[PDB]
Amino acid sequence: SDNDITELEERINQFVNLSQEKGRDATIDKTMRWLKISNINKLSQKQIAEAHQKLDAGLKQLDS
Amino acid sequence: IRNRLSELLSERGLKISRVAKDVKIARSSLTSMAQNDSEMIRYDAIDKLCSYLHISPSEFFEHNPINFDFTFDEEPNYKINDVFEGFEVTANITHAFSIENFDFEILVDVELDNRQKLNFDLDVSYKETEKITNSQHRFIFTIKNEDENIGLKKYVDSLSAGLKNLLFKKINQKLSGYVSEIIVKNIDDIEELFKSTTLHKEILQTDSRLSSDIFKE
Amino acid sequence: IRNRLSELLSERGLKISRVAKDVKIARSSLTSMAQNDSEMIRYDAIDKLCSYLHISPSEFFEHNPINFDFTFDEEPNYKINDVFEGFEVTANITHAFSIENFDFEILVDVELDNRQKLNFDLDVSYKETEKITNSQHRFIFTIKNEDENIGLKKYVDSLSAGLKNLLFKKINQKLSGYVSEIIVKNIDDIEELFPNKGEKSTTLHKEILQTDSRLSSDIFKE
Amino acid sequence: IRNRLSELLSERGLKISRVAKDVKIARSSLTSMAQNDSEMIRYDAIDKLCSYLHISPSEFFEHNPINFDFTFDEEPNYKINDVFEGFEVTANITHAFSIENFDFEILVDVELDNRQKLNFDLDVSYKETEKITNSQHRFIFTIKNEDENIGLKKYVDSLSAGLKNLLFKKINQKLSGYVSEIIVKNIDDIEELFPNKGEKSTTLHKEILQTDSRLSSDIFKE
Amino acid sequence: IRNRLSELLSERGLKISRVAKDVKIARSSLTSMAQNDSEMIRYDAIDKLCSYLHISPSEFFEHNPINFDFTFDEEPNYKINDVFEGFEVTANITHAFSIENFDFEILVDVELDNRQKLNFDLDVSYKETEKITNSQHRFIFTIKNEDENIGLKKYVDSLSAGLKNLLFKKINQKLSGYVSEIIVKNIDDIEELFKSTTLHKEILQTDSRLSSDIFKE
Helix, strand or coil: CCCHHHHHHHHHHHHHHHHHHHCCCCCHHHHHHHHCCCCCCCCCHHHHHHHHHHHHHHHHHHHC | CEECHHHHHHHHCCCHHHHHHHHCCCHHHHHHHHCCCCCEEEHHHHHHHHHHHCCCHHHHEECCCCEEEEEECCCCEEEEECCCCCCCCCCCHHHHCEEEEEEEEEEEEEECCCCCEEEEEEEEEEEEEECCCCCCCEEEEEECCCCCCHHHHHHHHHCCHHHHHHHHHHHHHHHHHHHHHHHHHHCCCCECCCCCCEHHHHHHHCCEEECCCCCCC | CEECHHHHHHHHCCCHHHHHHHHCCCHHHHHHHHCCCCCEEEHHHHHHHHHHCCCCHHHHEECCCCEEEEEECCCCEEEEECCCCCCCCCCCHHHHCEEEEEEEEEEEEEECCCCCEEEEEEEEEEEEEECCCCCCCEEEEEECCCCCCHHHHHHHHCCCHHHHHHHHHHHHHHHHHHHHHHHHHHCCCCCCCCCECCECCCCHHHHHHHCCCEECECCECC | CEECHHHHHHHHCCCHHHHHHHHCCCHHHHHHHHCCCCCCCCHHHHHHHHHHCCCCHHHHEECCCCEEEEEECCCCEEEEECCCCCCCCCCCHHHHCEEEEEEEEEEEEEECCCCCEEEEEEEEEEEEEECCCCCCCEEEEEECCCCCCHHHHHHHHCCCHHHHHHHHHHHHHHHHHHHHHHHHHHCCCCCCCCCECCECCCCHHHHHHHCCCEECECCECC | CEECHHHHHHHHCCCHHHHHHHHCCCHHHHHHHHCCCCCCCCHHHHHHHHHHHCCCHHHHEECCCCEEEEEECCCCEEEEECCCCCCCCCCCHHHHCEEEEEEEEEEEEEECCCCCEEEEEEEEEEEEEECCCCCCCEEEEEECCCCCCHHHHHHHHHCCHHHHHHHHHHHHHHHHHHHHHHHHHHCCCCECCCCCCEHHHHHHHCCEEECCCCCCC
């Protein structure tokens, strides 16, 4: 049923690592605050798909 | 009121540092005062400059009896659209959000030498955002009722180029502060994860400029 | 250099308060700036005043290229006898002490329009502790070599009456500050035993600093 | 501007209470509004009164386009000697203190129908602490430059008698408030040791605020 | 002002120690004063030297009425790049860091014998680093506006060779102290693990010299 929980962690770390790669500083906890997710386990497939939308826009646009 | 120290130095080719050494005045203060940026001037400074440049204060202070005053609506007609997406990639106010509408009237009094003064109302609405830099975007407002301001253009270009530029700078700052105050309150801060900037700080830094036939510069 | 506000409004007949109501400038700041004493001025102020009076800054700023820079002796030849005549009882500078002598050198580097600068040395000696009021006194000094500095006087009187008065003010103020500084370091704090007529008690220090010593010589008549 | 209620009912001969019973308006509010002193008025009030009196607002609102705006000195030239003559024992302003002098500048920006505005400066000085009653006194001031402001008087007398009285009231009230404010800040609270004839004890502050200082000059006779 | 004791001794071949013994003056002081390095001279010293060398103080003190004064910008235009790598191998400022930009104007007054003095502004920017030694590298600054300083070269070479060298030494020290003060504040100390030196101390020891057609020596 759910395999995106870890995918989300990879994509937030990609965001964080890319953000650090660009410049300044980036932390996963502040990245999680973008998604405003209290717990990674407690996240509905619908919300996590919405989360991906937030991240892809931050990471994919600067990649493409 | 227009300090011509800057112009005078361009005329004589005199470097700002050279003048500061000769007149025993701080370079920083002299350069700040060169473009008449500082709103305070020391009598000692002007005395020393006049004696040093062999000029009367007339060539230093250029004043046109005409006066311009600008009053912004207490409540403007503004609508906001917040994308909240793409601000993270690099400082960019446009990706974070944009102002759907921001139409408001500015009451401008062009005071003649005669005590009588002329009141002209200009309505400026959000036109677009100027991408001056990827980091900073300056909101653009266009005057809708330029017909009421036909005489406004005549008064504006009736002043010296330096004075025109001065006016443009003042109105630009005032507009920028006005729009920033209005927007920052309706905009939640977005941290720039990609040295540390909050979308609030972006709003503060982002300015706005009136693009119109009445004020082309 | 000096603003001509006092001369301008005297000619207009208007009052400072009336001008302040017109140009939206604070009465205290405007009245201070009306006097040539203020050393700083705002661009907003010059804009509003020049517009209100309908005049160019030419009429607002009286400038003469002759710059008079004054320097005083680091160490003066000063003797101040202390007479303990109940200063605390009576707040009179005479009661606190008396200047036996106060002579020193005032160097004036007068500069013309050209960088050519002429220096004039002033042997200035204390002459008398003139008593302006029963409450306060003004120290009076005199230039021994004033006859030598006759050329200086020629340059002083070569300026406008307003600018001459501004120099006199500047000289007096510098001299007052200098003399009060020397005396306050030389004389111990004598506080007034009784506040005078409900005025909060004032110490000799406050009196000597308040004391304004104006130089007297034919070089500076007005 | 002012409502002409007092003049209207004087002409009609009717009493405020009688009008209030007719238009269902509170006696206190209506009687206050009958006087020109009230600064606010209700549309319901103007409807009911205009209908009751069967008159258009033209007769109700006396308006003259000449606007007289008054401004006072932020810092006045005021000296108030304190005489401790048992104010607490006798509630008389004279017993509490006395004005040595109170002079200042009142700027009047008289505006015609056109935006053209003329400013008149009033050197107003305290003259006498007129004693209206054994209980309270009225401070009297006088304009030193009233002869200069002869044109102002020409403009004042150019208005209607009712409007002239309204100005006099406004000037008196502003002046009273200003003077009481200055004095209450300058004089310490002197409470009355004995309540006067069963009237609750009143402090000097209440007396000076109650004290109404009306300016006296040929500019403002009535 | 140029002590010629050094030159005089080279003329007469007299060893510094020999002079010190004959005139009963310390060798250390005499050798320090020989190249006019010390800025203080004793009347006794000059008296003894003049009597001993059979000379008037004219041949000892060579003075050119011309005077040179150098004023550096309070705020210079400088950018820093810190590698932090390779300083450890052996004392080397270049591996530890380098100054990406360091352009600043120096106001130089060449005073003539006549009271009138000539003000010349020279802008010197970071050109490169001189590897005088592996341990020490001296920053090189080139004058951009040498056109304004054409008369500067004429005045400079109008002086005696000793006086020229004196000027070069003074300007070099002043430039070195200026650049060291500016840089050490933005540079964290790096310990020389490979007797004990901190990159700060390296910055202090590292100097700078103006390489230009106006000052070739």
